[PDB]
Design a protein around this ligand. Sequence first.
Ligand SMILES: Nc1nc2c(ncn2[C@@H]2O[C@H](COP(=O)(O)OP(=O)(O)OP(=O)(O)O)[C@@H](O)[C@H]2O)c(=O)[nH]1
Lengths: 171, 244
Amino acid sequence: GAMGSMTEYKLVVVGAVGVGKSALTIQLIQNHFVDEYDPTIEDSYRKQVVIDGETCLLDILDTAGQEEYSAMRDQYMRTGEGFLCVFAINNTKSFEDIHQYREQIKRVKDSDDVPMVLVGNKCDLAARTVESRQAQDLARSYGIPYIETSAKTRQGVEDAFYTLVREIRQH
Amino acid sequence: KKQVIKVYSEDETSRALDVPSDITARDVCQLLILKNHYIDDHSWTLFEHLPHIGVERTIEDHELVIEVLSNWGIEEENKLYFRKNYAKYEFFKNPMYFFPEHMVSFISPTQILQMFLSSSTYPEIHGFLHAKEQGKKSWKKIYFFLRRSGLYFSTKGTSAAPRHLQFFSEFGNSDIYVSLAGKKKHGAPTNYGFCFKPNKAGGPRDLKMLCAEEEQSRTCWVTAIRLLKYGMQLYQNYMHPYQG
Ligand SMILES: Nc1nc2c(ncn2[C@@H]2O[C@H](COP(=O)(O)OP(=O)(O)OP(=O)(O)O)[C@@H](O)[C@H]2O)c(=O)[nH]1
C-alpha cells in the first residue's frame, strides 16, 4: 500500500508515592479519572498523537514511587528520553523528592541537558503546601518548564505531556 | 521469596508484578483480572512466548510461573503475555466428538473423557504429520503414534510394528508450543507448526519441530499431547476454576 513514517518518544513519569503519576497517565491515554489508589511497580502505555504537524508514537513508562523498587530506576533512566517530574502541590515531602530524581537522571544519563518538565499535580485542591512561584524557581533553576496539572479535572494533562515531547524535539 | 515479573498485552504494553515465588498461573491471571477491571471469563490466560523461535504456549493453571521463568536462557528475551484463550478447555466441554473418527483408539462422552485422563492407560493418537528431520532443513511426511510412553513414527508407511517404530519425543521433560504468524518457510509445508522444547534440566534443548496439514489437526495433536502430559490435573483445573 503505502509506507508511513513515524517517530517514537520514550516518556517516563517519575515522582514519589501517590503524587498522581498513573492518574495523569491514564487521563492522557484513556480519558478518565482513577479515584482509587493502585500502587504501581512499572506500567507501560502507548498513544498515537499528532504533534506540530508530525505523527508520533508516545511510549509512556509509569514508574514506582516505592523506594523498595529503586533498583529498577537505572534501567528506565538509561532508556528514557524525556522525564515528567511530578510532585503534588499539597505534599512538601514530594517536592523535596523530585530534587533527587532530577539528580539521579542527570547522573545516570551523564548530561546537564535532559528533556524534563516539572509537574505540580493535584492543582484542584484547596490545601496547597507548595506555592506556584516556589516551583517556578526550581524549574528556572533547571531550565525546564513548569506546568500545574489536575488528573481529576484534566487541567494541563495534554499541556504537560506535549510540552515534554517538544522539549525532546528541540534537544 | 519474591520475584518481579512483567506481563505483556497484545498491544505490547506491560505491567510489572511483584509476586511470591510459589504463585500459579491461575493466581497471576486473577490478580491481573482484578487490577485491570476485567470480568472473569475463565478464558484469561498466561502464555509463555518465545520470540526468537516464533512459538508460544498456554501456561496451565497450576504451573508455577517462576518455574516456567527458570527454564529460560538469559539471552532469550522470552515474554509472558496475558490474553483470552477460548480453545483451552474445548475438549472438556465437547469431548465425544473432539477427536476425528479415525485418529483415536483405546463413543460415550465421559467414556472418552475417562480414557484420556487415566494415569494407567493412554489411548493412541495416530495420523500423518510433517517432520523436520534433525539438523537438515528438509521436511518429510510421516505416520505418527502418540502413546503413554511418548511419540513415535513409522519408518514404513503407517506400520505400527515394533520393527518400524522410531522414538521421536518424551513429554515428561519437554513443553509443547504452537507457532505464531512467523516464517514457516524454514522449509515447513504449512503454517500449522508445533514443537517440543526440552527442559534445561535434561541435556541439550534441541527443538523437535512438527507440522500439521490443517489447523484443526494441530489442535487435536496439541490437545492430545497436553492431556498425556498433564493428565487428570488438566481436568481438575477446569472443574475448579477458582480452587477455593
Ligand atoms: N485531588 C486529586 N487527586 C489525585 C490527582 N491525581 C491523583 N490523585 C489521587 O491520589 C491517589 C494516588 O494517585 P496515583 O496516580 O495512584 O499515585 P502514583 O503517583 O501513581 O503512585 P505510585 O504508583 O505508587 O507511584 C489516587 O487516589 C488518586 O485518585 C489529582 O489531580 N487531584
